[PDB]
Design a binder for these strands. Structure first.
Length: 128
RNA sequence: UGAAUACGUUCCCGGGCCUUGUACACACCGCCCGUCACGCCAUGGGAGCGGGCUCUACCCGAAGUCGCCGGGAGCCUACGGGCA
């Protein structure tokens, strides 16, 4: 208790220059292998730009933004919570490739739709 | 390779520690209290029975004492008394 402890702060990834990136990679992270989950994200983004032509970064941030619950919310938990549904919803997708399921899950989330975004509407609506 | 979450955890499940207060107790997941079952002893009344004693009322027992009369032919000496 006290001191408000710490949460540490990491650096960008490579082609995006954002912290939330690695943070999200930590969610997809499993078995302790970030190297794998890393490419899974990059490849997931590559599919986005090769299907929408838009920046895979602006689609990522926006997606997570359209998931951060307002009520159920600290500016931090908004990230932890959002990243959760983004992975869970992407874990239950039709696509066979991990990078493909996440890619679609992100695009839909960025457009304000999908299972992850649908879950939020429920939590918020059941809170208000 | 390398997290997520860690302060809003102030609570609080639980442990430890300082401090306040209270009852009993110190085997403290205590201790007491009470009922029930068994054993022994003991207290009191009551319906009633047996024995002794006390108080009140009536019913006359004897000895003895006190008092009066006294038998008159009764038990007798006589200023007459008296005994029975």
């Amino acid at each position: 208790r006290r001191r408000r402890a710490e949460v540490r702060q990491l650096q960008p990834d490579l082609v995006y220059g954002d912290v939330l990136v690695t943070a999200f990679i930590n969610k997809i992270m499993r078995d302790g292998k970030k190297n794998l989950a890393a490419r899974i994200f990059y490849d997931a983004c590559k599919i986005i730009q090769e299907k929408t032509g838009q920046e895979p970064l602006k689609v990522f941030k926006q997606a997570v933004e359209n998931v951060k619950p307002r009520m159920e919310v600290s500016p931090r938990r908004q990230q932890s919570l959002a990243l959760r549904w983004l992975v869970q919803a992407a874990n239950q997708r039709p696509e066979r490739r991990a990078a493909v399921r996440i890619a679609h899950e992100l695009m839909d989330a960025a457009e304000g739709k999908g299972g992850a975004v649908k879950k939020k509407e429920d939590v918020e609506r059941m809170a208000e």
